[PDB]
């Protein structure tokens, strides 16, 4: 998958 951390504000950054 991809583009999941975008909803949070990181786009695609490490887990937490
Ligand atoms: C506190 C808090 O929310 N913490 C947290 C935990 C996990 C993530 C997270 C989620 C996804 C994607 N999902 C895709 C479906 O199966 C599970 C993972 C990611 C996908 C790609 C990348 C990269 N490079 C990082 C990701 N990071 C971001 C933040």
**Integer Cα distance of 11 and 2 in angstroms:** 9
Which of 1, 2, 3, 4 most suits a substitution to test ligand 1, by most atoms within 8 Å of the C-beta? Answer: 4
Residues lining ligand 1, Cβ inside 6 A: 1, 4-5, 12, 15-16
**Dihedrals phi, psi of 5, to nearest 5 degrees:** -80, -5
Q: What is the dihedral of CA 5, 8, 14, 16, to 10 degrees?
A: -140
| Alpha carbon of 11 to ligand 1 centroid (Å) | 9
Determined by NMR
- The closest alpha carbon to 1, from 10, 9, 11, belongs to 11
How many angstroms separate the alpha carbon of residue 7 from the centre of ligand 1? 10
């Amino acid at each position: 998958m991809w583009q999941r951390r975008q909803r949070r504000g990181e786009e695609r950054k490490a887990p937490e």
